[PDB]
Amino acid sequence: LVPRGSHMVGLIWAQATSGVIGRGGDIPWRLPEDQAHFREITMGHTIVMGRRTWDSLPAKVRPLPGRRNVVLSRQADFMASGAEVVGSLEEALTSPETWVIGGGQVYALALPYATRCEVTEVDIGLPREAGDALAPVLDETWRGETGEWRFSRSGLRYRLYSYHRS
Numbered sequence: 181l182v183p184r185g186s187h188m189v190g191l192i193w194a195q196a197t198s199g200v201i202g203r204g205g206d207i208p209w210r211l212p213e214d215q216a217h218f219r220e221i222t223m224g225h226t227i228v229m230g231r232r233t234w235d236s237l238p239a240k241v242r243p244l245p246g247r248r249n250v251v252l253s254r255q256a257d258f259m260a261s262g263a264e265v266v267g268s269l270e271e272a273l274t275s276p277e278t279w280v281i282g283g284g285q286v287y288a289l290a291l292p293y294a295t296r297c298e299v300t301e302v303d304i305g306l307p308r309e310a311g312d313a314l315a316p317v318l319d320e321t322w323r324g325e326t327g328e329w330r331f332s333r334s335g336l337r338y339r340l341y342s343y344h345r346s
């Protein structure tokens with residue numbers, strides 16, 4: 181439960197075991213169960229994304245429905261119809277509940293304010309490569325539960341972590 185006067189900042193991402201979350205401006209796998217999970221967590225809340233993550237969303241679909249979409253960019257004239265564009269992270273974090281939904285740069289910026297991380301680990305052995313977007317590594321202040329590996333319908337194995345801190 182979030183009191184309406186507070187500011188709960190959460191991060192939600194899917195990563196390969198290695199930490200890779202993005203490559204060539206795309207997520208380098210597809211996992212429908214994780215798409216559904218991402219919706220269940222974020223629906224009804226503000227979502228904050230960096231400009232490159234906005235670009236990675238299909239044009240017809242963005243802004244993602246049922247959520248207040250916020251795009252972080254330093255480009256004053258950036259066009260993101262249906263979203264709002266802000267030039268600093270702190271300006272993006274005024275709602276009672278906010279989910280930061282990527283990418284690599286914006287997770288790293290937001291982590292100091294965050295008290296929840298909802299992580300999907302994908303059992304794909306993509307090694308970290310030059311130019312990849314990477315997930316944060318959570319330090320010892322973060323704690324929580326680790327789910328069991330399961331086969332998705334597609335065959336790709338995954339497990340869910342729900343972590344938090346004070």
Ligand SMILES: NC(=O)c1ccc[n+]([C@@H]2O[C@H](COP(=O)([O-])OP(=O)(O)OC[C@H]3O[C@@H](n4cnc5c(N)ncnc54)[C@H](OP(=O)(O)O)[C@@H]3O)[C@@H](O)[C@H]2O)c1
Nearest residue numbers: 193194202205206230231232233253254282283284285286
């Ligand atoms: N697997 C997952 O869960 C997941 C989720 C989301 C995204 N992704 C992937 O991650 C990749 C994108 O990540 P990324 O790290 O390259 O980019 P990003 O974090 O999505 O976006 C970076 C952009 O955000 C803006 N920005 C960054 N810091 C800022 C600040 N302090 N103030 C204002 N604006 C700021 C800048 O926009 P301007 O250049 O316009 O100024 C910057 O170029 C893609 O491959 C995407 O598909 C993966």
Ligand SMILES: CCc1nc(N)nc(N)c1OCCCOc1ccccc1CCS(=O)(=O)N(C)C
Nearest residue numbers: 192193194206207214215218236237281282300
């Ligand atoms: C489902 C991926 C995902 N999962 C987790 N757990 N956290 C994230 N932040 C997260 O990213 C959501 C925002 C980026 O979405 C992208 C980006 C590039 C390529 C594909 C997708 C999937 C979009 S979607 O299928 O879910 N949809 C139509 C909006």
Ligand SMILES: [Br-]
Nearest residue numbers: 202203204205
């Ligand atoms: Br990338």
Ligand SMILES: [Br-]
Nearest residue numbers: 207209210211
């Ligand atoms: Br996906």
Ligand SMILES: [Br-]
Nearest residue numbers: 241243244245
């Ligand atoms: Br959607």
Ligand SMILES: [Br-]
Nearest residue numbers: 212332333334
């Ligand atoms: Br499937």
